[PDB]
């Protein structure tokens with residue numbers, strides 16, 4: 701039972717707590733209602749600022765509810781996430797024109813958030829939401845900074861999309877962490893398999909190294925001074941993208957390689973990525989959603 705909502709139904713266990721599908725009692729609309737699993741006043745103010753952000757490729761934060769010493773976030777509900785859509789599309793693959801549309805849209809949403817000095821820090825297929833009109837939207841922008849290195853979830857957290865600087869213990873987040881994650885998601889849409897499905901912080905880092913080569917001071921000045929860098933890390937040579945994401949074409953592989961540079965400073969920006977030749981013929985196809 702809830703004092704302001706009716707027909708509350710659990711969607712799943714989110715990064716910050718349980719997420720419900722809920723029907724506002726006054727208005728009848730259906731929203732995603734996120735109960736933050738506390739044991740953070742600064743976290744109200746900061747998240748409340750995110751109510752002001754509005755872009756077609758960002759899931760709207762409708763409200764921040766602090767009542768009865770509980771904290772809830774209210775977002776615009778969408779019917780499917782990209783993880784479920786990829787699973788539903790596994791036999792055929794997501795068509796290339798739709799992969800390209802979704803990547804383009806996701807870059808537009810990141811470029812918007814980054815221009816407003818908001819990072820995600822934890823993009824993953826389970827917080828990318830899709831609708832029947834061919835849109836894809838990013839949920840939970842800005843929450844990690846406002847929450848913050850900290851775990852609020854009971855589920856196994858996924859590491860598969862974490863940038864290598866994070867895994868190497870750098871406590872300084874930049875826009876580049878979101879480009880990395882999106883590159884990993886791009887590769888997963890194309891190949892129908894996760895790019896780096898690590899089961900721990902070291903297995904994640906070693907999966908990256910075995911594909912991209914062990915980083916060194918030549919490709920990543922400063923890497924050998926990251927907090928968790930060890931000189932004893934095996935030295936793997938780097939494989940070619942052509943083996944990693946076939947049959948993605950020359951344009952897609954070039955863009956992906958720029959999204960996956962080791963040095964965050966060298967990683968393409970969202971804005972620059974939107975100008976890449978890969979998007980010359982981008983379109984907005986209609987997806988086949990089974991709800």
Ligand SMILES: Nc1nc(Oc2cccc(CC(=O)O)c2)c2nc[nH]c2n1
Pocket residue numbers: 711712713714715716719732759775776777778779780826827829839840
């Ligand atoms: N249907 C739906 N689901 C959402 O988030 C979930 C719901 C459950 C789990 C996760 C995964 C995670 O948090 O790791 C995200 C929404 N956010 C805004 N609108 C939303 N609509």
